[PDB]
Amino acid sequence: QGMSVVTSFYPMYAMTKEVSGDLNDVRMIQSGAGIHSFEPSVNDVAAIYDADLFVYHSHTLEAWARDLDPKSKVNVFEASKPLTLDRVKGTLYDPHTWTDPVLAGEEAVNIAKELGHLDPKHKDSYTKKAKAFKKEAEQLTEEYTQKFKKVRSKTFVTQHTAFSYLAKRFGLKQLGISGISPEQEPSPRQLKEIQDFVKEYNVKTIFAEDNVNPKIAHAIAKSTGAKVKTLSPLEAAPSGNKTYLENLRANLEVLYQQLK
Ligand SMILES: [Zn+2]
């Protein structure tokens, strides 16, 4: 009862699920680490072909989604079609929009439309709930755009380049030890450039993430006089049952408390 929905990783599962409510059956492909270097198993693609809707974030992330041509009434929906992804500096694009409350809220809205478009009978519950999500997202944005405006230290160093949009929306500066993907690891040379960055901007916290070994994270910490903490890009299903925004909110707090 209700259409089968399938999502790529955590931010998609959370959004479509909170928007659908109890209506459909939402499932997720990759709930762990590696969405960047992930490739679906034959089983994964099968669940996609037996599902009424399969929502994934982008072609710049789930590259494997582009190569799916069904005989099944399954809809492939690239939820971040509207958004305008920034180019990667240093051409490819930074897919990390979901860590930005606004862009996240407006992508959740886009899913509500696709949900409503396939099931007009309940198009209200979809749009009704998407109003809430988007709403809670503005409230969180206002709350933190305010808290960060009171903070002097504006720079933070994360495991990889995953917080460019979040840093952007709150007037912060972020530097990743690794690139857009956790696989794009730094050479000894770049390790030096990062340590010099931490010293120059006087960063006192290097934010490791669960999805990757903090060995290097800790090394830089020891050498630049900083402590290691955890800042999650929400790419892996968080422990506990919080809302997408409450999880995001949680991290907005550690960042905030740290820069303070
Ligand atoms: Zn990432």
**34 Rama sector, left if φ>0, alpha if ψ -120 to 50, beta otherwise:** left
Ligand 1 centroid – CA 178 distance (Å):
10
2 CA distance to ligand 1 middle (Å): 32
Helix, coil or strand: residue 178: strand
Ligand 1 centre to CA of 185 (Å) is 12
Report how this structure was experimentally obtained.
X-ray
Q: Cα–Cα distance between 61 and 66 in angstroms, integer? A: 10
CA distance linking residue 169 with residue 153, whole number of Å: 16
What are the residues whose beta carbon lies below 5 Å from ligand 1 (ion)? 162
Instruction: Give residue limits of the domains in the chain.
Output: 1-151, 152-260
- In b/e form, how buried is each residue of 124-149, taking b as 16+ CB within 10 angstroms? ebbeebbeebbebbeebbeebeebbe
Classify domain 1-151 at the CATH superfamily level.
Nitrogenase molybdenum iron protein domain (3.40.50.1980)
Q: Please name which of 107, 103, 110, 96 lies closest in space to residue 35, comparing C-alpha atoms.
A: 96
Q: Shortest CA distance to 167 belongs to which of 227, 249, 35, 255? A: 255
* Position 238, amino acid: P
Q: Calculate how far, in angstroms, residue 124's C-alpha sits from the geometric centre of ligand 1.
A: 33
Establish whether domains 1-151 and 152-260 are of one fold.
yes
CATH superfamily membership of 152-260: Nitrogenase molybdenum iron protein domain (3.40.50.1980)
Tell me the binding residues for Zn(2+): 36, 96, 160, 235
Q: If you measure from the C-alpha of residue 34 to the centroid of ligand 1, how many angstroms do you get, rounded to a whole number?
A: 9
Residue 205 exposed, middle or buried by CB count within 10 Å (0-12, 13-18, 19+): buried
Nearest-10 Cα torsion for 98, 104, 110, 115 = 80
Those residues with Cβ within 8 angstroms of residue 104's Cβ, 6 or more apart along the chain or in another chain: 11, 15, 97, 98, 137, 244, 245, 248
